[model samples]
Target chain A: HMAVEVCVKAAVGAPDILGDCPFSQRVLLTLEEKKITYEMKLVDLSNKPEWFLKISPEGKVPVFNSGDGKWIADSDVITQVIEEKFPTPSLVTPPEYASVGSKIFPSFVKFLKSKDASDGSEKALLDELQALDEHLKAHGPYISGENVSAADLSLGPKLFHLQVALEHFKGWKIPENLTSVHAYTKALFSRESFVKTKPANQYLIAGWAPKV
Target chain B: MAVEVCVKAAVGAPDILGDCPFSQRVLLTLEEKKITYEMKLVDLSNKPEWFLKISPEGKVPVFNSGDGKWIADSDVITQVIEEKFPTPSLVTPPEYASVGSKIFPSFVKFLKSKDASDGSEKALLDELQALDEHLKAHGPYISGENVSAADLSLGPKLFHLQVALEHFKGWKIPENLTSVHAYTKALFSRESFVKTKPANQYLIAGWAPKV
Candidate 1:
């Protein structure tokens, strides 16, 4: 009842090191930014424990147990819960700031959406880089602006996957065309928040790295 | 401070109206729910006069007010605003129910995902159809227990594919589709939502009704 415990599928260092765990990192960054202290119980997604299943029912990672009573399942819902519970410097931006953050998705849709549904999954994988390419070409320096918001946090882990997906595309290279995104990734990875809170990648880019 | 407003676009109903804001029905539902609101309008597909200036190149239904208050783009956000402001006695269900109701989109995704074409879509849709068919076979309700969000969503959406895509020239929606068109038209037309749907004079003017 006294403690607020956050149940995350935690990967210690990189976003991909933890499969389907970037969502956890996004919320963790929000919790960290708000300076809210909570207990993080890591659950291996493959062999989920009974306790998580009991709580989530859906059994997705990044389920929140408010310990006192409230139980939230789904990463999107978890974001809303944190925002509603503690509205401080505000993990979500105000209406005006939220604009640039929101519109970016449609362009992402244009990039990610299958051009006549030829195995669209790969397009979805490539969409992040395409979004980055267009975004960097259009608006560089940051995703939303000077200060990073939840938008950046949401983009971080997704983009990490895109960077790896780029390695596979022969004719459609992301890093070459989308130079700014590549540069922005370097800037984002350098940040203390990203360094401190990023989960280890379970899929790609798992090498000798410091624990978060 | 007291009054709240939402911005929405006047567009054709989404291809997946059951889960999406089909023809701006989401905006209309807000009005029908007896919620206090105003429309900060935007042109569909094309930006309006104030929309681009205010919403920062965002498309229609940017959804916020002049005082720099809370606004969001998603229909889910629209629902959230109403739930927070006008929490009804029993109209709105408990937390878990509310969450389950929101699964309308997932249900829509289940019906129309690319998987439906592959073996996965058939298996998944069979599982999903059982849920949909349960409502029809039992009471035309997805959740089966009560008229949850699933019903509310299906009321508006699930029938369009049959109308628009059924046996069209070279393609079709799905093979084992059980959803009835007449059932959908009746339900969607009767729902309090469509009765108060957002004005789509533009859409109505642009496209001819399907013959």
Candidate 2:
């Protein structure tokens, strides 16, 4: 059993362990999915402890310490490290299309935060979603075909945020026509790891309320 | 005697490759590693025919294999370069990776028009100061003892930003940031940097004429 230590967000106004931070969710989901035993260290991002800052100067959530207390931040970097360290339930995918889902998060954030509203950011977000939907239509069930790879883990939280926030704030929805994406989202959420690690809808709504 | 690749960088004018920070990172790494690369300077605004097909995103700094398979993105290319040429040992210590390299894209946008809110500019400056502090805590090199890919990635933008900002607006990196200021001058004066330093006049011209 590898000594894995993860620092995640503490849910605000609740006894729940994890908060609504998608990046943090990436690490939790990865750990849960890999079935790696890990200790959770919750930090209030609003009030980071001194020890947390020492480990992560940026105070970014999802600081991961893989056996021997070696710390690494950044979700993508952490996931890669985890996959390298624990290979049983492999999350590695081909380099070519492995990072495609990453493009969605940024576009999603841009579309959500844009004050202009009519900017091309929305189209950029839709285009990436459409591309992913088409890929799933062809590749089915998961991003890497027949198995849940790191791509799905990386993409799951952002898709959740995209689905919930866009609907509540913008009155927008991932149309029923995009059947593949809808199916993929449903499959991802149904995973035990995702079901357990997902932030409460209230936390997400409260998190986005200020931005909206 | 390894397989050498060619790099396509965006140039604003003759001897100037400052327009794209991403391209500069590639060139800077190649220079530091002493890797032989054919430089194809494509003017960013008016990209040439062959270049567009190679880089579908219409982005600069596309590194190509000898037979024309191309890879884009500075981070990805830097990793490839490090892997291909491991003799010099560019991999730095683990703490070095702590500093996220995500600031460059937004920084490039901020530099182009300076139309972004003060918040963005502050964030960029804050990022630099944080690096400077890290350097002061660490040493003359970004990864300590010897130069690494981290320095190669960062040196280009700081050098260009220093040049462009000093030329357009009498803005100099404050003297108080002695460590960073010294580091900046040292990096720019390095043999590799001097060999690839873009023309200052061309950089000033390419940028928006004073906000």
Candidate 3:
């Protein structure tokens, strides 16, 4: 059987590793976890190719094509398409568990961008982390109990970036008291699929340097 | 078994649909699928403790599948609905899923713009023009023939875009954009959209304070 070719972002300077796109990594983690064999095409956003523009005028990342002329964008659509086509070890986040920790990403982004200490963005992120920590403490090694699911794949990338952002921007790290969160991060970052697909720490720093 | 969900209460009218396009999309999804569901109206001004508990961020539109717990966010809620009731699938193909995604934000910017020279008006026109161009080819819905989830999401936004823009600025879709007008008419005429669409007054009223 011929493998599908998925288009993803490449680290700007270092094209070897994946870029600092959380959505792109989420789809890659889905593919890796499902044990789907696929060829990867890295599209550098800085200098997009003519063919890339022809396929996707929007020029978004983590697009997919199974040798079809059309390219699929949006991680949600691409992941759903991949799951329906493959249908093994479904990464479908359960209806109930689907939104667990969903607020963390938005909260993290707000806190990361905040320069004002009195605005409560930092507190908001801490509250979400504490909520996630408690949830993990009671019901998770992964977001959906033991097995890695879509929620984990979706959350893990952001969590990884959160660490990078805090360490780089504020010289901070996840609180020591949040033991469950620490363990959860360890497991998510240690997975072979995550290791194989994640960009190096250097590119992640470089990618966000301009944003900060 | 019936599903339970909550949406925002229209300003000055607690029983009717609110101005939330996100909430309307969820209702449209349920209605289109012929899914039996109960709707709870939430007043943003006076949110109950239990409602806030279910909605992590204290937002409207949380869902309770009797088989499933209260799930927040319309994106996940709509997807869960599709998963549970797979008949008459509303899954837009990945290739067609993103059609007209830019229309909503551009519409908002243009609606709120104080002047035309700021480019918000042009941006919105460009999005509408693109939608008109797209519908000329992939007519009668955003996805070629069938009304899919993409249309459901965009339908509510377009309704707001039309009513809000016209009420605020005495604006209307240009005469040349016939395809966009037709697509809007078809979507607005749908049983699902008609069932869930809030009154034009309510839509206009909701955006008043913001504008």
Q: Best candidate per TM-score, number?
A: 3
lDDT of 2 by residue, A1-212 (tens): 12356777877744225689898888888887887645566777777767678778888888888755577888889888888889888888777668766788888778888879679999998888889888888887788787888888889899999998888878878778889889999999998888878888888888888875
Instruction: Spell out the clash pairs found in candidate 3.
Output: none
Candidate 3 residue-wise lDDT, B1-211, digit = tens? 5688889887656677788899999999999999888888887777767677777687778888876478878899899989988888999989877778898898888888886457666567667767877888985888877899999999999899989987887555643355777788889998998889889988988999989
TM-score for chain B in model 3: 0.95
Task: State each model's CA lDDT, in order.
Answer: 0.49, 0.72, 0.81
What DockQ does each listed candidate score? 0.01, 0.01, 0.01
Chain A TM-score of each model, in the order shown?
Answer: 0.69, 0.92, 0.94
Clash list (residue pairs), candidate 2: none
Tens-digit per-residue lDDT, B68-176, candidate 2: 6788788998898788777777887777875636446535555654442344444555566676677788877787667787777778767666777666543345333
Provide all candidates' interface root-mean-square deviations.
21.5, 19.9, 21.7
Query: Per-residue lDDT of B35-93 in model 1, one digit per residue for the tens?
Result: 55655544445555555565665644445423455455545654664566454321334
Per-residue C-alpha lDDT of model 3 across residues A1-212, encoded as one tens digit per residue = 12255777887854434688889888888877886545465677997876567667888888887544457888878888888888888887777788888898888778777888899988988988999899899888887788888889889999998898779888877798999999999999999888867677777787777776
